[PDB]
Design a protein around this ligand. Sequence first.
Ligand SMILES: Cc1ccccc1C(=O)N1CCN(c2ccc3c(N)nncc3c2)CC1
Length: 276
Amino acid sequence: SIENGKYTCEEPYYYMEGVNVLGPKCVPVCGVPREPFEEKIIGGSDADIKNFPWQVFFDNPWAGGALINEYWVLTAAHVVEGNREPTMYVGSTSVQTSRLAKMLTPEHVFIHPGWKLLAVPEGRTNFDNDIALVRLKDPVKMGPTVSPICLPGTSSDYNLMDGDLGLISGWGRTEKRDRAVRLKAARLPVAPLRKCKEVKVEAYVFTPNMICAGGEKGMDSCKGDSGGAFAVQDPNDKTKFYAAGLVSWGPQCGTYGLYTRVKNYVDWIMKTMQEN
Ligand SMILES: Cc1ccccc1C(=O)N1CCN(c2ccc3c(N)nncc3c2)CC1
């Protein structure tokens, strides 16, 4: 008897890496939602957790994260900077208190060393390296409503280009509410960093570690959405999603926003997880 197996692994959620070659391990399949998101968060539409099974809900500051493996949640630094034991939920379209009673227990929070720590969050101008990892106590059981997202490769076909389409999803501010009750999502293109800089508001810092995204239709993520995955189609498989970006910060809700360029952190991510 192996974990997550019969030897069939429990497919479509797990896969084998098969009195025996070895003389067997069933491990999660990142990136493949059961029902893909259907377009009709600002400028978004209704999303089912099904569409975004990696989506994680942080409660204490209202934020999001992405499940990347059974022990690790990935989020923005700023989201855990001053919440070292965050309350995270998974598996749910509604974040209504009723529906809030699957929860993930944090074991350790790992902030990126290049994040600038602040005692008082208000008026941070510098969101460089807005990336942090959260190790869970118990492994997450995958299914229709809970599965990881893929990470980027360091290969160049992972370099994003202006116009690349991605997904944002969260329970943040909408045109109707300050915090959504049900999951919301939008499709939006990667934009040149000047677009972000041109929204008039010590100056905000823009680094190469930050994706700008947004455009004509004024789709955007906002407060409440932060730490969630900007989900991009795997360069070689259109049905598999990886986290190109993390919802970091933005000059003005409904304009253009800034997302942690995950690719630049893949080595660190990998190393943190191995060494822990
Ligand atoms: C500091 C903190 C810690 C925990 C939870 C929330 C916060 C928080 O309050 N902030 C973090 C997220 N943030 C963004 C991010 C993207 C935006 C965007 N893309 N467009 N318009 C506005 C945007 C605003 C607002 C400030």
